From a paper:
Here, by solving the crystal structure, it is shown that MtGlu5 from Meiothermus taiwanensis WR-220, a GH5-family endo-β-1,4-glucanase (EC 3.2.1.4), has a bipartite architecture consisting of a Cel5A-like catalytic domain with a (β/α)8 TIM-barrel fold and an inserted CBM29-like noncatalytic domain with a β-jelly-roll fold.
Notably, the inserted CBM is not a fixed attachment, as its orientation varies with respect to the CD in the monoclinic and tetragonal crystals of iMtGlu5 and MtGlu5. The CBMs of the two iMtGlu5 molecules differ by a rigid-body rotation of 22.5°, and they differ from that of wild-type MtGlu5 by rotations of 25.3° and 10.8°. While large-scale conformational changes are often observed in enzymes upon substrate binding, the moderate flexibility of CBM in MtGlu5 probably allows switching between different orientations of polysaccharide chains. Because the CMC titrant and its molar concentration of binding sites are unknown, the n value was modified to 1 together with adjusting the concentration of the titrant. The data show that iMtGlu5 has a strong affinity for the recognition of long single polysaccharide chains with K d = 5.71 × 10−6.
Author numbering: 15 to 452
Amino acid sequence: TGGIVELNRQLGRGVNLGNALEAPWEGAWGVRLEEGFFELIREAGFKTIRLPVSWTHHAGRAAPYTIDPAFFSRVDWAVTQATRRGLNIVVNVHHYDELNANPQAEEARYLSIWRQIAERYRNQPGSVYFELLNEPHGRFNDNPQLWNDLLAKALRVVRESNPSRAVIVGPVGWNSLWRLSELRLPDDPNLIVTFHYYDPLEFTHQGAEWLNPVPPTGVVWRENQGAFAAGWQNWSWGSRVGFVGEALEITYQEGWAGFYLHSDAGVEGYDRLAFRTSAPVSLQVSCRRDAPAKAVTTSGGVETVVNLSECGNPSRLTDLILQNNSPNARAAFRLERLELRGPGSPLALLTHQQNAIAQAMEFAQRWAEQNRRPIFVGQFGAYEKGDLDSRVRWTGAVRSELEKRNFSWAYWEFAAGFGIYDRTTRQWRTPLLKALVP
């Protein structure tokens, strides 16, 4: 055949049947599967269903951890409805609180679950894909090597009965592309690498009721909006930090407040930090956590440059802090420029939203090309609390960059809160669907 590259290409455009079998039981989170869903998805031009399945509530707590035959039968049914409509289907292990909380303790039960799944579907055609663990987090975030070791063990279990089926594997940080460099894979030739994409979280998860506190809404997304460079998260504290038009406004609202960008990936090869403020600002500059900061005072409209060796001297720059050098709050100012400099080409930390999407997909593609692995972006979507035009813009921009890079993908999700199909009106949410299938 064509190998794993062709299997990934055949994944093509896909959609998640979410809020369904990955809840503790089907319908617990609002979506019960129906046969007509598969037909609608096929008719809308998707080639693939991703089927999130949380198995732990359906398996014995004691060895041999047998999965409920009725639940297994429901997964059988979904596999059948996909296949009979000419769709691919990705079967995963999705939510698994116990495993993320204690990988070592829960390992045997998880591996038994995978052995049951792999043996049960061993004779399915190449249109059926396995996905070892959705979004590893918890202890896996603390020690990524736990996930590297576990995924290798689970892969060996799967390969005992499925010697060549495509197996989808992602990094920790909830399948964050920024943690790809911590992922380590065995030399198995039939692996597809996955990441999920929700940047910027302030927009895609605005109004998320599952968080405490609930993030604010009314966040708009536009290609030309200001943004931080891809992968630099706003970890600021004690401050109002935000783009207003072309300007990054910083209000230090308390003593020692900090403007703080953090990257899970980090960067190498820079030796200086350059920035410019609209007013003279007295700062503590730090580019390495728990390292000594350097005191600097800028002047309005005039660039200041600081050698990284003098404010923490990191080898891999992951944390960048401009801290209010004062026990009191400070009036708002504009950060007009912020860029890293080195022997090579500078890194502008301030950019625009569209370019941030492109930068993220370029980073993933560089990883995938270096490691010679195909890429499937198994989840991306913007929550319904955002205004629809912004969601359409974001969704189409993301899908476009994905396909420009020949990433296969699966939108989150078919129905419910990220949904593209309105089950009440029994109609597609047309502009969002068109963002995915133009």
